[PDB]
DNA sequence: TGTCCCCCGCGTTTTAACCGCCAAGGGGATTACTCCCTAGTCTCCAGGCACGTGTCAGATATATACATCCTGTTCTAGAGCGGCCGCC
């Protein structure tokens, strides 16, 4: 219990910076013109943009417990 | 018959094997829509098969000729023997 608590504290303490970095992810216009940005996780909805990272990773953990996340993709999302 | 070096029986310490357990994700297995070319004819015709035959390379023949193997004679190296020489 305390180990999972410390892991969630490590998630939440940097969450206010990670969410700000993701929400202000300035994509390169030249990479968008040439189709160079990574859209591997954006097709299945694994992107963290436009939402809080902690609630999204709680939902991701719930579905990974449910066994329909194809776990290595969840590793890539993390 | 010998021998010695190559393999076997066993002590010891690593070393990976098998079961215990967990997901994954290509991949075997199944079902269905569709589509080409293979089953089956019609006709024929040009390549394939039966027959006849001039022929051109293989075999028989034999003196000549290879061709290597077996054997006889000689060359040269090695061990044994005897004569000569120096020392006690």
UniProtKB/Swiss-Prot annotation:
Present with 1660 molecules/cell in log phase SD medium. It is found in: Nucleus. It comes from the Eukaryota. This is Transcriptional regulatory protein SIN3. Coiled coil: none annotated. Component of the RPD3C(L) complex composed of at least ASH1, CTI6, DEP1, PHO23, RPD3, RXT2, RXT3, SAP30, SDS3, SIN3, UME1 and UME6. Component of the RPD3C(S) complex composed of at least EAF3, RCO1, RPD3, SIN3, and UME1. Interacts with ESS1 and STB1. Catalytic component of the RPD3 histone deacetylase complexes RPD3C(L) and RPD3C(S) responsible for the deacetylation of lysine residues on the N-terminal part of the core histones (H2A, H2B, H3 and H4). Histone deacetylation gives a tag for epigenetic repression and plays an important role in transcriptional regulation, cell cycle progression and developmental events. SIN3 also has a RPD3 independent function required for normal longevity.
């Amino acid at each position: 219990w305390t180990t999972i608590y410390e892991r969630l504290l490590e998630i939440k303490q940097m969450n206010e910076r990670v969410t700000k970095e993701i929400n202000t992810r300035s994509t390169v216009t030249f990479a968008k013109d040439l189709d160079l940005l990574s859209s591997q996780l954006s097709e299945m909805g694994l992107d963290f943009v436009g939402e809080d990272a902690y609630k999204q990773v709680l939902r991701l953990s719930r579905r990974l417990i449910n066994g329909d996340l194809e776990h290595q993709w969840f590793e890539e999302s993390l």
